[PDB]
Each structure stands twice: as C-alpha cells, then as structure tokens.
Ligand binder design. Structure first.
Ligand SMILES: CCCCCCCCCCCCCCCC(=O)O
Ligand SMILES: CCCCCCCCCCCCCCCC(=O)O
Ligand SMILES: [Fe+2]
Ligand SMILES: [Fe+2]
Ligand SMILES: [Fe+2]
Ligand SMILES: [Fe+2]
Ligand SMILES: [Mn+2]
Ligand SMILES: [Mn+2]
Lengths: 285, 285
C-alpha cells in the first residue's frame, strides 16, 4: 500500500535508537569477506582423512549450511513487518543482519566447494527433528508476519529465529566446532569463518532480545508466551542434538586418529545452558 | 510455507551466476560508511547562504531523502519473490542492494542533521507527480509481488524501481547535484556522498537490466510491456522535473552569488536522454 510520508523528510533518523546504534556497530564490525578466507589447508586436511574420518564433520556442516540458507530467506518477513510498522531504524539494522547471513551461507558453501564435497547431498544428515525446526517451524513463524504482525506473532517469530535457531543451536554449533576441530588442528579456514560468524551473530541475538523485550514491556503476559514458545521447540532442539551425538559416537575414527577426547555430555550440557541463558535474557518486567 | 530442501546442502552456490558475480563486486566496492563523511564544511556553507539561497537547495534533497527511504522499504517484496522462486544468487546480491539503500537514507539524513534542517518538513517540495511515483506507483508495483510474481509483475516492478526511479530520476539527480554545487565549491561532504551513491547505483541498475532481460528472453512480447511501462511513468517523471525547474527559475540568487550558468534546459535534456538510454539497455531479442 501507499506511503503516507517519509521519516527522513519530515524529520531525521532517530540517532539515539538502540537499533540505529546496533546498525552503526554492524557497519564498523562487518567488513569481513568469505572470499578472502584461505581454504587451501582445509582442502589438504580433508584429503588426508580416510572416508570414515571425512564424514565426521559433515553432519555439523550440513546443519549449518541449511540453517544459514534458511535464516537468509526467512528474515525477509520480519523486515517487511517492521517496515510496515514504520520502524525505520530496525529496518536499517536488518539490512546488515540479512547481508551477514548471505556471507554465512557463502562461507560454508565455499568450504564445501574447496574440500571437494560440493556435489554431495548433505540432506541425509537432517533428521526429523531438524526438519521440524528448519524446514517447517522457522518459515511458518516468519511467514505468518505477512498477514499477522500482532505482538504474539512477532514474539513467536523472534523466539524461533533469534532465541532457538541462532541463540541456542547456532551458538552451540560454534562451540562444538571449537571443541572438536580446533583441538585437532583441522580446517583453519573453516574455523576462521566460524569466528567471524560468531561475532556477527552476537548482534543478531541483541536484535532478538530487543524485539522480544520491547513487546514484553507492553504487557507482562507476553513473557509467559515467550517461555511457552521456547519450551515447545526444546524437544526438537534436543532431538537433533541427540541425533548428532549418536552419529558422533558411532563413527569415532577421527577422534581416535587425532587423539581427541570428545565429551559429548559436555556438548549436551552446553546446549541446555544456552537454552536457559536465552530465557534469562528476557525479563517479565 | 515450508522449505523443500536447500541449495547449499544439495549442491553449492552457482559461482558463475551473474548475480553472484555482482554480489562479489558489491562486497569489494561497498565498504564506504556515511558515518565517516565530514559534513563540518557543509554546515558552514549552509549557514553562510541567505534564507533565499538556503531553500534553493532543499527541493532536490527532499526528493532524494524520500526516494532513498522509499526504495529501502520497497525492495523487500522483490527479494521475497526471488527467494520464493529459489533464485538464491539473486537474493545474496539483493542483501547488498538493500544495505546500500540503507546507507543512502542515512547519508542524506546525516546531511540534513548536520546543516540544521532536520526539524524542517521537506514534504512541501513533493508535488503531485512526485507522489504519484514515490508514494503510490512504486510501492504498488513492488507489493504486488507478494501475491503475483508472474513475469509481467516482475518486469513492471523492475521497470518502475530500477529503470525509472533509479535509472532515470536518481541518475539525473546525481548529475544535477554536480552541475550546481560542484562548480560552486559548496557542500563537499554531500558531493562525496553523491559520488559513493552513484557508484552503488551503477550496480543496482545492472540487477534491473539482468532481471528485465531474462524475462524478455523467454518471450519477446514482454519487451513491448517494458516499453509501455516506461512510457506510462514518463508524464510523472517530466512533471516532477518541470516542477523542480519552475522552483529553480523562480529563485536565482544562488546561481548569481556563485556565478553559475544553471542550464535548466540542459538538465531537462539530460533526463530525456537518460530515459531513452535506459530503454536501450534492454533488447527485444
Ligand atoms: C553435538 C552438539 C550439537 C550442537 C548443536 C549443533 C547445531 C548445528 C547448527 C545449525 C544451526 C545454524 C543456524 C544459523 C542461524 C544464524 O546464523 O542467525
Ligand atoms: C531539474 C532537474 C531534475 C533532475 C531529477 C531529480 C530527481 C530527484 C531524485 C529523487 C529520486 C531518488 C531515488 C533513489 C533510487 C536508488 O537509490 O536506488
Ligand atoms: Fe544470525
Ligand atoms: Fe525423535
Ligand atoms: Fe539503488
Ligand atoms: Fe502536472
Ligand atoms: Mn548466520
Ligand atoms: Mn539509492
């Protein structure tokens, strides 16, 4: 529909808005380019591995590649909803959020291309719980915003996207990469990419917290909805984590060859810790 | 609705896609930050103008500030339409397109703030023809894509957005800024911004040309639609240009003060030429 007028004609950008300040940080801190990462040692590393050692990292990379692609596509309805609400500074920030995710998609795909598994269909490592989150719950909650931008809808979208997918699963995946492959001295280009992704995703979670909290500030009853929506998704989070753990325990050749001690119980507790920590970052009041 | 699968899990990014190459160029060439522009001399320049010279500058800035804000919001439906079509490389590029427009909004608003007119409502310089394009025709054509992503809808959207708004009006506005203020020595920060904007917008127009031409390549009958949609908006393009000209001719102190021969007939001929050049960037075959 039509534009009634424009904020930067009637007035200016709200220079003190928290999302404008986050937009400014994103420009300053967002200059990295996946095209500059040297994957040449990753290629040699991957080639040096046996077939059974090779597959060890792929379930995780499969989860990330799909995840980054999903969040790239599925942030667009949130940007649209906030734009229609006239929240210009949120929109400015979300352009950096979307461009970040584009780079994240690119980073993992560049890695797959470099190590020679670009032609492999990694969908085999998406179990039912993963599909329930990334193929279904995430796009459903986001696409809802095109026809229902109520506070309930916006909280549910930010919960699934920012607090579960990014704030629980992605953060735990970064930790896992460091606990396993950084200890093995493997895939230095991928691990460089992970470090840049982790920095970007700190801003993304701040936007989710800002968005949920500002709606909770309007009516404390929305706090109960946030907790409920978190708890609804937990079975699929831990169902996917348990699936990745089972795969890891059934193919132990990389851990043995590299004399690693992968504590899968420690990884499980980190996911639980992230989930609970995300809940603690929203307050009823 | 649901994702059926993910391109970067089943395969990789299409590294040779034209919009991937444009995305790569956008990252390499899109590092500028409006927050680094020094507007201190612009502020002194504006303060030194008489009231009658001050307002001479503002119709153009009013047209740009609203325009950049409009195109920042109104690109989201195109990104959604192409995402839904599975055009991943197009989406990656459009994240750079959207973020560029955010910086363009920011640049003009920072200028307005710096020179002391942030509080002034510049909407008074939007005549009926301007409103018909930016308040109405542009958002209508873009929002259509949420419910109708037919080739006809996509061509109309890219025509209004990329070939008229950007390719005819913004390009002529950049030329106009340089014809008036570059020779005068005035507003060096704004002119620095204009130079960065013009570089960004060169990439943007290539996406519009790519998009229109790939649809024309499937059926030459869409070429006649493109020409029709351009001609449909021409009356409002020239109606706005004639309005700005009338404001310019009715206030000549800034030219006299700065020894400018502001050839308003030359600016009009530039707009006509731009319009015809954009039509010629699309080929029937
Ligand atoms: C064995 C420990 C399991 C740890 C959890 C692993 C989860 C893999 C990560 C996939 C989700 C990535 C989502 C991207 C979200 C974003 O970038 O904003
Ligand atoms: C008297 C000469 C008139 C010249 C025409 C002036 C046009 C004003 C510019 C407003 C439109 C800006 C739209 C931005 C498009 C984009 O940024 O991709
Ligand atoms: Fe993210
Ligand atoms: Fe299960
Ligand atoms: Fe543009
Ligand atoms: Fe008229
Ligand atoms: Mn990401
Ligand atoms: Mn622009």
């Amino acid at each position: 529909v039509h534009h009634d007028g424009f904020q930067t004609v009637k007035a200016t950008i709200d220079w003190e808005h928290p999302m404008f300040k986050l937009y400014e940080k994103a420009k300053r801190n967002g200059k990295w380019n996946p095209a500059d990462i040297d994957f040449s040692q990753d290629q040699k590393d991957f080639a040096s591995l046996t077939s059974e050692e090779k597959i060890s990292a792929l379930p995780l990379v499969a989860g990330f590649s799909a995840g980054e692609e999903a969040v790239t596509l599925d942030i667009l309805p949130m940007a649209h909803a906030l734009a229609r609400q006239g929240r210009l500074e949120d929109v400015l920030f979300l352009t950096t959020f979307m461009h970040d995710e584009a780079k994240h998609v690119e980073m993992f795909s560049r890695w797959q291309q470099a190590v020679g598994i670009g032609q492999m269909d990694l969908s085999v490592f998406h179990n039912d719980h993963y599909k329930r989150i990334f193929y279904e719950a995430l796009p459903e909650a986001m696409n809802r915003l095109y026809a229902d931008d109520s506070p309930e809808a916006v909280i549910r979208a930010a919960t699934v996207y920012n607090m579960i997918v990014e704030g629980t699963l992605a953060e735990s995946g970064f930790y896992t990469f460091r606990q396993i492959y950084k200890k093995a001295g493997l895939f230095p280009g991928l691990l460089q990419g992970i470090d840049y992704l982790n920095m970007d995703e700190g801003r993304h979670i701040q936007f989710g917290i800002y968005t949920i909290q500002r709606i909770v500030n309007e009516d404390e009853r929305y706090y109960e909805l946030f907790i409920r929506y978190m708890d609804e998704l937990w079975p699929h989070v831990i169902g996917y984590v348990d699936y990745l753990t089972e795969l890891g325990k059934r193919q132990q050749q990389l851990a043995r060859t590299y004399a690693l001690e992968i504590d899968y119980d420690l990884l499980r507790h980190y996911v639980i810790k992230q989930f609970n920590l995300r809940k603690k970052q929203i307050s009823r009041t």
